[PDB]
Amino acid sequence: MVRLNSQSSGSRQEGTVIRILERAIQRVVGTYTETRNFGFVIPDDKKITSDIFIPKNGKNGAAEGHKVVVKLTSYPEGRMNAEGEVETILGHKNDPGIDILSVIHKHGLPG
RNA sequence: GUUGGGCACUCUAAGGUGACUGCCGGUGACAAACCGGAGGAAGGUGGGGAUGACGUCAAAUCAUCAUGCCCCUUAUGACCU
Numbered sequence A: 001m002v003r004l005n006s007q008s009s010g011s012r013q014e015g016t017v018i019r020i021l022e023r024a025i026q027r028v029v030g031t032y033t034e035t036r037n038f039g040f041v042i043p044d045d046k047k048i049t050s051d052i053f054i055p056k057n058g059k060n061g062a063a064e065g066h067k068v069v070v071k072l073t074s075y076p077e078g079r080m081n082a083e084g085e086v087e088t089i090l091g092h093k094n095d096p097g098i099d100i101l102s103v104i105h106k107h108g109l110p111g
Numbered sequence B: 001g002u003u004g005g006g007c008a009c010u011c012u013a014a015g016g017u018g019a020c021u022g023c024c025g026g027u028g029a030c031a032a033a034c035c036g037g038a039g040g041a042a043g044g045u046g047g048g049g050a051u052g053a054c055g056u057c058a059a060a061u062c063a064u065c066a067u068g069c070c071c072c073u074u075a076u077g078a079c080c081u
Helices: A099-105
Strands: A003-004 A015-017 A027-034 A040-045 A052-054 A067-070 A084-092
Touching: A015 A067, A027 A052, A027 A084, A027 A099, A040 A084, A052 A084, A067 A099, A084 A099
Parallel strands: none
Antiparallel strands: A003 A015, A027 A040, A027 A067, A040 A052, A067 A084
16 A cells, blocks of 8 residues: 655655555575675565575575575565575576576476 | 792883785676675774975064164163162
8 A cells, every 4th residue: 555645756646655465575586695694685686676684594505696596584674674595596697597597486487 | 019939910112023905705807996704903094193385465573582774872771679
């Protein structure tokens, strides 16, 4: 649900998200990255602007540069990013056919 | 510590070493960089003080001092209370 702002700064009508009724995204594919004490995953859907925090026990074997599926445990809240767990490792992002395989996982196509 | 007690530690202060993106992940010209690893007291210009250029104000000082020419020169010298 979106509240309608009285003033628009442009041609189109502006609005603010007041409430979330239904959550669409529950899985996110991306590229895993390893920091010192925690992971992240950079989402292939760039419409997800924020990097998904992976806690160290959610890594499940994912190395640097591996395309990974990630299940959302939490959503973003304030300035905190979304956290998750690596559900699947696809492989490395430079391996032939992982590009397409990443698509197959992004939509949730049958294996 | 008061005393014997080597003197360990601490302190004192001479002489050294120590940080360099050096090394390791990513990233990116395969480089630089950047992001984050470690190690270390210290992390990415260690932190402070010291040491700049050519400037102009005929800026200020003859009550720092000195000073060419003036003036005072039994006083514009000097001494006391």
